[PDB]
A = this chain, B = another copy of it.
């Protein structure tokens, strides 16, 4: 699809068999989701935001479907204001910016 930016570019994602709403975020290097259960082990990660840095849990090789496109990659879990799909998965789904 082609998504304009007059409103937040919110899409439905599917992860662990559940639907969530998430923001397609070209400013985010990484995908970060609100607290949830994910399978497997996690590793520590620090990410920097507008307000400073936070600690998050890093899960690798996680299956996630984004606006109907399947991806398998790194998902960080922690105290984010909204679920955010970052460049690590935007590239998997073939997303570009155009003007």
Interface residues of A (CB under 8 A from B): 1-6, 8-9, 23-29, 32, 47-54, 67, 69, 80-81, 84, 87, 90-91, 93-99
Name 14 extra pairs, CB < 8 A, besides A5-B90, A26-B97, A32-B50: A2-B97, A8-B87, A25-B26, A25-B27, A27-B27, A48-B81, A49-B49, A49-B51, A49-B81, A50-B50, A50-B53, A50-B80, A50-B84, A90-B99
Given A8-B87, A25-B26, A26-B25: A96 touches B3 (CB 8 Å cut-off): yes
Quote the shortest CB–CB distance from A86 to chain B (angstroms).
8
Q: How many copies does the complex hold?
A: 2
Quote the shortest CB–CB distance from A94 to chain B (angstroms).
5
**Residue among A9, A48, A97 with max Cβ neighbours from chain B (10 Å):** A97
